[PDB]
Design a protein around this ligand. Sequence first.
Ligand code: ADP
Ligand code: MG
Length: 378
Amino acid sequence: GPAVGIDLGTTYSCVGVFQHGKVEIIANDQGNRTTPSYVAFTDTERLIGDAAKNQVAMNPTNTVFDAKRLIGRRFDDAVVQSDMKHWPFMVVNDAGRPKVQVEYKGETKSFYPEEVSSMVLTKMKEIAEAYLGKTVTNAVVTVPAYFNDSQRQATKDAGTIAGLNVLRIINEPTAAAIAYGLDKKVGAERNVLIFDLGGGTFSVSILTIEDGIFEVKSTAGDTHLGGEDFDNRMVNHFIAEFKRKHKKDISENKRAVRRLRTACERAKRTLSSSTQASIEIDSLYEGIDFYTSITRARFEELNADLFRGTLDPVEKALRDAKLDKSQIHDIVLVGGSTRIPKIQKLLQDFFNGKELNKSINPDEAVAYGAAVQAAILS
Ligand SMILES: Nc1ncnc2c1ncn2[C@@H]1O[C@H](COP(=O)(O)OP(=O)(O)O)[C@@H](O)[C@H]1O
Ligand SMILES: [Mg+2]
């Protein structure tokens, strides 16, 4: 059976396989090429992926996400203490280790973060198997460059309990470089910049490649900046508009808000290709149907400061690595958010017109590289 490459992401995961010299990003049951890192527990079942995300506004306390933020970490971790203040699900301490507590089939159950991630890992695996028409065993799973040994250990473990034989854990920026073939030996040192703007995490990494050997010279970014922050700005904008037209504040109604957010995220995706998108929501609050729309222009100004601030981590990464803009040879876009036109303009302007590597879907780049790496290791 072919070895596969898996991008176990904070908000979205993706799986690819290298066959016949070509890499293939496998679409799921719903036809999507990336699937949410969501797990939901109900009275009758355990939902994973799209099915899980497609019901979060109905089962908030029992729909788990952001497990990547917990994995390989302790409960006493300041990160965890901060993070949990925003999760609708419970996180309990267990001999120092954090566990997520949910209600499955009427009974109260808790899971270790690596158990949650294995659930997502199993979903990717079954997706691969359904496509390949054969059982998948060996795999290469990716992890951020800043993960310590504990976090990598836990990610590896999430793999074993999923029935996956993890051939190797490689960094996400490194996987992105390999996808574009920037790992080939050209008898010279090459500086590559990875700009990763995903769903809830932002990471900039500068890699130096010589004779096939990578070297993460610098890294910067924000663990709490991603495509979700852009959705929120849209939401706040519409919560205000609704109040104008219908003099009703839907803030308190968690369901109205979550349904509006889903419509915003989708409009956002459209905005990367069109200049305007319509928001059509039936019976948002009470029996009022919310029919409206946004323009790319307005979208851009609602997120202006966020988009712009994206350059700060870029400057920092540069000075740490001790390099000038002119010294970086290649720039590769990773993450779903990099499909945004204004982000591409902004970065290009910063690197004074330099060409951006973006022929491979940024949200598939990591999986793609892992799949190639899985291939060589098998
Ligand atoms: N066309 C698009 N325009 C803007 N954002 C997009 C587009 N397609 C996907 N996204 C966003 O990408 C994010 C997911 O990014 P991804 O890199 O897949 O996640 P992760 O950070 O989990 O690795 C979401 O915020 C989603 O809205
Ligand atoms: Mg990612």
